[PDB]
Amino acid sequence: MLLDKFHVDLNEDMSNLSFKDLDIEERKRLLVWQARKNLETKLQSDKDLQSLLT
């Protein structure tokens, strides 16, 4: 699981960060965090996505 692998906490907040300001390791953490947050939002409106989890 990506959050476990890259040590991104479930409840972490990285809303203020830009990739340009971060080193490579922190860029990976930001990419994972943004992906998770973007899916959370999508999942709350997309029934087809919800269906995949049941």
Place this chain on the structure above:
Amino acid sequence: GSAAASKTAQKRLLKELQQLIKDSPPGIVAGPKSENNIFIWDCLIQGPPDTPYADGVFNAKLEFPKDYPLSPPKLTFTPSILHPNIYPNGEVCISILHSPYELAEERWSPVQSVEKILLSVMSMLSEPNIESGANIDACILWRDNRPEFERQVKLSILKSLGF
């Protein structure tokens, strides 16, 4: 091979890293996994837009041979992802990663670069080539049952992000 070859590879890989960071291609984060071994890189790539991979990010290991750039690196998605041009075990099978099935080009050569490899992988994710596919199950699903292909890819993305 030779001590000289190893020296040249490390020098070249430093330049490759500098170029990649300088160019900063969107959706790609890659660099040496540890500070004392430039021959093994950890990569994280954002799935390309308007593909089943769009909402995902994908981890891969990029391993360079001791005689780089006379041999291509091996790139392995970890965990493996479903895609016509990725072996079931995660190993990426595209022209740029092979030395001179099924001809044409462009195959690996020392004038290629890591950035070019990573850009090719992104293009691959957007445009699968089933005619030279390494995962026939993925090939058939892509051709015949795109809805199911996409459902499997998207479920795997959801699971990878903790849903």
